[PDB]
Amino acid sequence: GLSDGEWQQVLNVWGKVEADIAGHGQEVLIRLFTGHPETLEKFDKFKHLKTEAEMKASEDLKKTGTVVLTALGGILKKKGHHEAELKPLAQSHATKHKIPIKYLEFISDAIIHVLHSKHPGDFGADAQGAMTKALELFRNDIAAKYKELGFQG
Ligand code: HEM
């Protein structure tokens, strides 16, 4: 999917996320959750959250943001060589959590969103470029694993 000039850009950018993994992860789930409320319903431990103050105020969400961004970061550093790390992922979201690929689209968008909000002006057009393709490659490989499982819905 990507050139290493592009990989280069992705890890450049992930350097931003790693300086504050907990904050980045919190705002991603908040951007996910507030924009597409049906997504909250897939989490039984965040179901109670009703307002953004509550989410904001929730320590368990900051926690889940770190797990999520820690796992993706683990995949991105593989530079597309991630069958081993993604299968387990795709299996769990399809069979156990029942997560529609559309939701993986929403969170992909939510990361691009967040990044511009936290780093206005230092999230280059080129960087957006690389990051979007990287998220697409991630999403595409999951989509395939999802097809195998007939995880239609
Ligand atoms: C970049 C995308 C994502 C990554 C890297 C990610 C990562 C993870 C990891 C590492 C776990 C725990 C281990 C496991 O169950 O496999 C997990 C659990 C879970 N994920 Fe995701 N996830 C992603 C997207 C999503 C989305 C979009 C949703 C729903 C809109 C979601 C819903 C859940 C749920 C419900 C669980 C179980 C939560 C619990 O522990 O109670 N995930 N995810």
From Swiss-Prot:
GO MF terms here are:
heme binding; metal ion binding; nitrite reductase activity; oxygen binding; oxygen carrier activity; peroxidase activity
Q: Does the keyword Methyltransferase apply?
A: no
Q: Which domain of life is it from?
A: Eukaryota
Write down any Gene Ontology CC term: sarcoplasm
Q: Where in the cell is it found?
A: Cytoplasm, Sarcoplasm
Residues annotated to bind nitrite: T64
Chain positions with Phosphoserine modification: S3
Task: Give start and end of each Globin domain.
Answer: 1-147
Residues given in the record as O2 binding sites: T64
* EC number assigned by the record: 1.7.-.-, 1.11.1.-
Keywords for this entry? Cytoplasm, Heme, Iron, Metal-binding, Muscle protein, Oxidoreductase, Oxygen transport, Phosphoprotein, Transport
Among InterPro entries, the record links this protein to: Globin, Globin-like_sf, Myoglobin
Q: Which Pfam families match?
A: Globin
| Record GO biological process | oxygen transport; removal of superoxide radicals
Q: Spell out the reaction equation it catalyses.
A: Fe(III)-heme b-[protein] + nitric oxide + H2O = Fe(II)-heme b-[protein] + nitrite + 2 H(+); H2O2 + AH2 = A + 2 H2O
Q: What class of enzyme is it?
A: oxidoreductase
Q: Which residues bind heme b?
A: H93
Oligomeric form and interacting partners = Monomeric.
What's this protein's family per the entry? Belongs to the globin family.
Which function does this protein serve? Answer: Monomeric heme protein which primary function is to store oxygen and facilitate its diffusion within muscle tissues. Reversibly binds oxygen through a pentacoordinated heme iron and enables its timely and efficient release as needed during periods of heightened demand. Depending on the oxidative conditions of tissues and cells, and in addition to its ability to bind oxygen, it also has a nitrite reductase activity whereby it regulates the production of bioactive nitric oxide.
In Swiss-Prot or TrEMBL terms, this protein is called: Myoglobin
